């Protein structure tokens, strides 16, 4: 693997996405891989959603 | 001469003015393009020692109901009622000249309003 | 003096005010640059312990027709303003006590055809 | 036959008129979509050789209190007080031809306003 | 019955109206969010064969001072409003053949210092 | 008792109204932030069978000059003069039910205006 004239984020961003991995900041931690989140929610038109 | 009285929160008030209106949207060719919207009620009342209308706007956050009755000869002519409403404007005015100095003006935005054999209902999904 | 009578929904009302108008757009040199638009009738009547205008408005999918008669004095028909395929698109009821004004109703009608005298204006509503 | 008297800056003034109002926001079909805001007090008084309301306004960093007493018979009927307030508008008009000799209009923006058994407060950061 | 006199450029004028105002910006929650601004005096006086207010606006660009004294009772000076370091920023002169005062002049003064009684407003002009 | 006479295009008219004004700009601390602009003269005249002001307007490429003389009581008090000006607005109104059966109001835009020892001049790049 080669790093060619790029930053730390730019190198890791392209390398992990080309291998099909999740790579993002969740709000307090940096997540590498699938977290398997199953939390759900309900939203209704003209109850919670102003526009769709 | 007309007599209009307002029954609100277990009290009686003397009414000076009243209004309510409805509307629709219209295309560029004069064709209606929306549904009926509106139905706010504007009231003008003579102030007194009691301050019940103010405590209903601030101290409470529950919907209420009320009625207004109009008498022409002395007899009952019409009655306008609302249910599931809120007070969204309030104003108290004092003017030391004359002609009813102490007055209160407020606006009610309700879901159902009724007068005579006519009804207006709003779709507030829950 | 004058008198105006409104026949609507199988009933007759007394009319205080009545208005209608039309216009078209023009250039900066004054040449007209559009066609006619805006045939609406504004009516002012007095409310008498009945709610028939309001019931017609809340039935939103029913076009109606109406007519107004102008009388020069006394018993002489002068004009006749008629409409067909119309809807009420504005309604207001006012009550006043301090100013000694009776209960009044103001409303606006937007129709497809309006006629008066030997004149007639129509709008193309697609079928 | 009535009076309004303003007690402010350790003095007494005679009010010509007074007003205050509150408001809420609603959406296209009458459902409230905000909280109550407003609550300023607008006052009209006759100007004598005092120049003390201007002295308080120029003091830009010292809040104050006040009260207005409305009398209907001749005894007190209602009272509108404020606490922790500032003067935010000031106008002096001197008309000679008309019957507007010398008058002052000013607005008060406070944190708490009380009248009767009702009150309204704003959460100013501490 | 009141009287008011304006002492400007070594001359005396008779005042029909006077007004001045101050302002302060307010946050959405009711707190003040700025300091005092404003301090502009609007004056409405009578007109005559002399043109000395217009000369000071046009033919001269220098700061000037002025004074207005209010008299009550037909002696016993009521108040006195003073200004210094000011410029005339508006001017208007009207004549009406029919109706009340024939010839009037209206003008507005924008100054740095304003004194009335025991109150003083000063603007920070950083020079 | 007051009179105003307008001498214009070799004729004399009776003036009902006259106005002129000037202005500057300020920058929210009261300090002037531009130079003086304005200087238009608005006149109101009673029209009598003579369509000669309108012919002057239609002559779009020719400047003119004029004078207005003010007489107080039962002698000249002031004189307003313009030179190198054009008529840039014209209105003629006729009301039968009301008073003022026929009147003309118009505006003049001139390079120089002078009144009683004061003068205002604009620069025109020719």
Structural overview:
Chain A is α+β, with helices and mostly antiparallel strands. In chain A, 19% of the residues lie in helices and 12% in strands. Chain A has one helix and two strands, in the order αββ. Chain A has a two-stranded antiparallel sheet. The radius of gyration of chain A is 17 Å and the shape is elongated. Chain B has 126 residues and is mostly beta strands. Chain B has one domain (2-124). Chain B has one helix at 52-57; strands at 3-8, 11-23, 37-46, 64-71, 76-95, 103-115, 118-121. The longest helix of chain B is centred in the middle third of the chain and has 6 residues, at 52-57. Chains in contact: B-C, B-D, D-E, E-F. At the B-C interface, strand 2 and strand 7 of B face helix 1, strand 5 and strand 6 of C. Strand 5 (76-95) of chain B pairs antiparallel with strand 2 (13-23) of chain D, so a sheet runs across the interface.
Structural class of chain B: mainly beta
Please count the helical segments of chain A.
1
Oligomer: part of a larger assembly
How are helices and strands ordered from N to C of chain A? Answer: HEE
Write out the strand line-up for the largest beta sheet of chain B, numbering strands in chain order.
Answer: 1-2-3-6-5-4
Instruction: Tell me about the largest β-sheet of chain A.
Output: 2 strands, antiparallel
The geometry of chain A reads as: elongated
Distance between the termini of chain B: 44 Å
| Portion of residues within helices of chain B | under 10%
Number of strands of chain A: 2
Identify the most extensive interface between protein chains: B-C, 32 and 32 residues
Strand content of chain A: 5-15%
CA radius of gyration of chain A: 17 Å
Sheet-strand content of chain B, in percent, reads over 45%
- Shape call of chain B: globular
Terminal CA distance of chain A reads 44 Å
Query: Class by helix and strand content of chain A?
Result: alpha+beta
Helix content of chain A: 10-25%
> Can you write the helix and strand succession of chain B as a string?
EEEHEEEE
Largest sheet, strands/sense/barrel of chain B: 6 strands, antiparallel, barrel
Protein name (chain A): Type VI secretion system spike protein VgrG
Organism (chain A): Bacteroides fragilis
PDB class: transport protein
Keywords: Type VI Secretion System, VgrG, Hcp5, paar, transport protein
């Amino acid at each position: 693997v080669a790093r060619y004239k790029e930053t730390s984020y730019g190198f890791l961003s392209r390398l992990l996405r080309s291998y099909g991995e999740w790579f993002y900041y969740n709000g307090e931690t940096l997540q590498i891989g699938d977290p398997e989140i199953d939390t759900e929610s309900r939203a209704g038109y003209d109850v919670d959603l102003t526009g769709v | 001469a007309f007599r209009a009285t307002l029954s609100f929160a277990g009290k009686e008030f003397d009414v000076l003015d009243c209004t309510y209106s409805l509307k629709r949207d219209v295309d560029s060719k004069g064709r209606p393009s929306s549904n009926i919207y509106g139905g706010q009620i504007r009231l003008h009342v003579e102030s007194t020692d009691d301050t019940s209308i103010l405590e209903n706007m601030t101290n409470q956050f529950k919907p209420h109901s009320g009625s207004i009755v109009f008498k022409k000869g002395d007899a009952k002519m019409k009655e306008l009622t609302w249910e599931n409403g809120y007070i969204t404007e309030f104003t108290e005015n004092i003017d030391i000249v004359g002609s009813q100095p102490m007055t209160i003006t407020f606006v009610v935005s309700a879901q159902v309003i009724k007068i005579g054999g006519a009804q207006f209902e709003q779709n507030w999904p829950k």
